[PDB]
Design a protein around this ligand. Structure first.
Ligand code: HEM
Ligand SMILES: *Cc1ccnc(-c2cc(C)ccn2)c1
Ligand SMILES: [Cu+2]
Length: 152
């Protein structure tokens, strides 16, 4: 990414940081509605059936904050994120067993929520920048997955 593209990424991410939990809720709800098979990866989660139940779930809201906190730290590294990706690849390859296709699904949900909530800060320039940033994340975590023996 160019420096300008990183700045577009972090500009819209600052909007996410104004209410991390609400963004995380919308992102995970979009993920679970669009790809319900991902629900099975979480404990005490398959039982959630309606959007209202999903919005009421403290576990879901906590999880969305966990995801966005870690992703935001990664994005702020502007690609220099090997030390941040290392523990994530470790757990997601060997314990949670999250295939790259699921990381694509959550990337799509992130982009959907950012476009829905911040269209003025998420035009084609910023969309493409965020696309590139999330593609770089997925590329680098996929390489670490394989180092750990996981071909997902
Ligand atoms: C942007 C992508 C993602 C980020 C930054 C992220 C980040 C994290 C972090 C920081 C944790 C807690 C520490 C750890 O266990 O490593 C975690 C836990 C977890 N993640 Fe991810 N995650 C991502 C995507 C996903 C996806 C797409 C799934 C499933 C479809 C998933 C499933 C899980 C599970 C099952 C846990 C265990 C925590 C729990 O639910 O008890 N992750 N994630
Ligand atoms: C429904 C859901 C979504 C995301 N995370 C969870 C969860 C549940 C527990 C018991 C612990 C950690 N995360 C649930
Ligand atoms: Cu969780």
């Amino acid at each position: 990414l160019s420096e300008g593209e990183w700045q577009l990424v972090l500009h819209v991410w600052a909007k996410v940081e104004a209410d991390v939990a609400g963004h995380g809720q919308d992102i995970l709800i979009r993920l679970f509605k669009s790809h319900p098979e991902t629900l099975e990866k979480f404990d005490r989660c398959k039982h959630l059936k309606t959007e209202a139940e999903m919005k009421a779930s403290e576990d879901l809201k906590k999880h969305g904050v966990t995801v966005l906190t870690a992703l935001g730290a990664i994005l702020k590294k502007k690609g220099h994120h090997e030390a941040e990706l290392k523990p994530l690849a470790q757990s997601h390859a060997t314990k949670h067993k999250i295939p790259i296709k699921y990381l694509e699904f959550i990337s799509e949900a992130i982009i959907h929520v950012l476009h829905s909530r911040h269209p003025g800060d998420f035009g084609a320039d910023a969309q493409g920048a965020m696309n590139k940033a999330l593609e770089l994340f997925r590329k680098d975590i996929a390489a670490k997955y394989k180092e750990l023996g996981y071909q997902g």
